[PDB]
Amino acid sequence: VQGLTEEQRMMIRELMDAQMKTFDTTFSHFKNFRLPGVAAKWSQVRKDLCSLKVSLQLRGEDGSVWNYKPPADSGGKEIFSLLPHMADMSTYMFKGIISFAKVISYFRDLPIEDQISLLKGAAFELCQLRFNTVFNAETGTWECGRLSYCLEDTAGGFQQLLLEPMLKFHYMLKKLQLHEEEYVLMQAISLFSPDRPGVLQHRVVDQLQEQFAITLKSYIECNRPQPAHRFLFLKIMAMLTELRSINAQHTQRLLRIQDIHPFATPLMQELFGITGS
Ligand SMILES: C[C@]12CC[C@@H]3c4ccc(O)cc4CC[C@H]3[C@@H]1CC[C@@H]2O
Ligand SMILES: ClC1=C(Cl)[C@]2(Cl)[C@@H]3[C@@H](Cl)[C@@H]4O[C@@H]4[C@@H]3[C@@]1(Cl)C2(Cl)Cl
């Protein structure tokens, strides 16, 4: 129930309300998305693209199932086949994240230039945090309603996958068995990083972030006494630091792939600083 102040409990209520209003957990309104059709840069792009191999499944409302197994790298443009779809899913998630931020009072009250700077800085991280809540660790599958993204069983097993930092993050974060309140506090802490590029109100954003972190620390103290949740707050704060690193890494991968194979949606260009010229 509580153990927090009035301000902390209202802070959680507003974040949970924003999450409820802007997170389409069944992905019902993700429609009209593209599907894979029926010189030293490339070597790096090829290494970037095969770091995440997923099969894709569509369950029809009628009960039909479409299933897609991707191709192995044969030395050409077939490794780009899932990029338009993933760009459309990313764009759909980004829209939910932007709406999430905009209905938060602490975010509305910041200058619009800081809003844009914080969203540009954190949108990828909040997308990852939401994707973890639909991640099934036992089946290696992100269950997005009628869409499923299954990690391709590969030599090395579920331990070679954990070498990919994005996949280790999702498995490790899932192992913590966080509450909805803790996930949405992680989103706030990430969205309120005072040191994003181009932030002006460093002091205000830092004070807001510290309050979201203290609320999280206090929430864990009051509602998780079990020995398994010892240092849970510090584990969460270390995963947020890792997520920031994965954010920087995946931003470089994106810019390299985009350099030789353009695929970013207009909203992705806006968030990752691509002007169109
Ligand atoms: C995850 C990868 C880097 C990050 C890329 C990205 C990065 C941001 C984004 O909004 C969408 C996508 C889809 C393609 C992703 C890539 C597919 C393989 C590569 O590892
Ligand atoms: Cl890395 C990755 C891919 Cl690719 C998927 Cl399909 C999705 C794309 Cl649309 C966007 O990068 C985020 C997630 C995440 Cl984590 C999953 Cl696996 Cl859900």
Side-chain angles (χ1 to χ4, degrees), residues 3-6 8-9 11-12 14-30 32-45 48-52 54-58 60 62-68 70-73 75-76 78-101 103-152 154-157 161-174 176-202 204-206 208-277:
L4 325 161
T5 73
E6 265 321 286
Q8 303 183 318
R9 279 164 53 212
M11 179 172 286
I12 293 177
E14 153 144 83
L15 296 173
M16 287 298 292
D17 187 62
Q19 184 89 308
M20 172 268 292
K21 286 167 173 162
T22 64
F23 191 178
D24 184 17
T25 58
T26 72
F27 294 71
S28 298
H29 304 304
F30 179 44
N32 313 325
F33 47 77
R34 290 164 290 177
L35 286 171
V38 309
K41 293 163 166 171
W42 286 75
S43 179
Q44 189 52 39
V45 161
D48 291 334
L49 276 170
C50 75
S51 297
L52 183 136
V54 287
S55 59
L56 172 149
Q57 168 164 310
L58 269 71
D62 46 22
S64 53
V65 183
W66 274 110
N67 215 281
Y68 177 80
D73 187 357
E78 61 281 0
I79 62 185
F80 299 141
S81 61
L82 271 169
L83 283 184
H85 174 79
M86 279 148 48
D88 289 341
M89 170 59 88
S90 242
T91 299
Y92 181 73
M93 298 295 291
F94 286 144
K95 284 168 182 172
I97 297 305
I98 294 169
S99 311
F100 171 78
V103 290
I104 293 173
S105 66
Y106 313 93
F107 186 86
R108 277 197 312 263
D109 296 336
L110 300 164
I112 189 57
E113 294 84 19
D114 291 327
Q115 300 190 22
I116 293 160
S117 290
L118 291 180
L119 276 165
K120 285 190 180 187
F124 172 86
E125 297 171 22
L126 276 73
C127 173
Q128 287 316 315
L129 291 172
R130 287 193 162 176
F131 267 130
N132 196 77
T133 68
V134 303
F135 183 62
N136 188 319
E138 290 77 32
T139 75
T141 301
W142 290 271
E143 303 176 335
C144 308
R146 306 206 164 277
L147 301 83
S148 285
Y149 302 95
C150 189
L151 287 167
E152 282 297 80
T154 292
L161 289 178
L162 264 62
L163 303 185
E164 187 53 41
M166 170 96 288
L167 299 185
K168 189 211 246 203
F169 170 85
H170 277 282
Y171 277 103
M172 281 183 56
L173 183 52
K174 197 77 190 196
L176 297 182
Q177 317 199 22
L178 302 184
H179 299 166
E180 301 274 6
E181 290 77 359
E182 308 175 312
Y183 272 109
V184 78
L185 280 158
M186 293 184 69
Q187 296 175 191
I189 294 159
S190 162
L191 189 62
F192 284 87
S193 304
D195 58 336
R196 303 293 183 187
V199 168
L200 304 177
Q201 223 75 72
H202 182 72
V204 169
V205 182
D206 191 69
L208 286 169
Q209 183 190 56
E210 188 181 357
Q211 297 168 11
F212 287 120
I214 289 168
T215 292
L216 174 59
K217 186 176 179 322
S218 302
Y219 176 92
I220 294 170
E221 283 191 39
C222 299
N223 308 324
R224 293 169 164 282
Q226 296 88 346
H229 313 305
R230 289 180 64 184
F231 322 114
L232 179 58
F233 170 76
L234 289 184
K235 293 179 179 182
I236 289 169
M237 298 303 283
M239 304 224 63
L240 283 180
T241 298
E242 175 69 20
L243 183 52
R244 217 178 186 275
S245 179
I246 302 174
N247 183 5
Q249 301 169 335
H250 278 233
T251 290
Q252 310 313 321
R253 293 191 192 179
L254 175 87
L255 294 185
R256 283 193 302 272
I257 300 167
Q258 178 75 8
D259 195 21
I260 71 176
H261 187 65
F263 81 108
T265 62
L267 184 52
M268 284 167 60
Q269 304 174 38
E270 201 71 53
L271 289 168
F272 290 96
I274 296 182
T275 56
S277 84

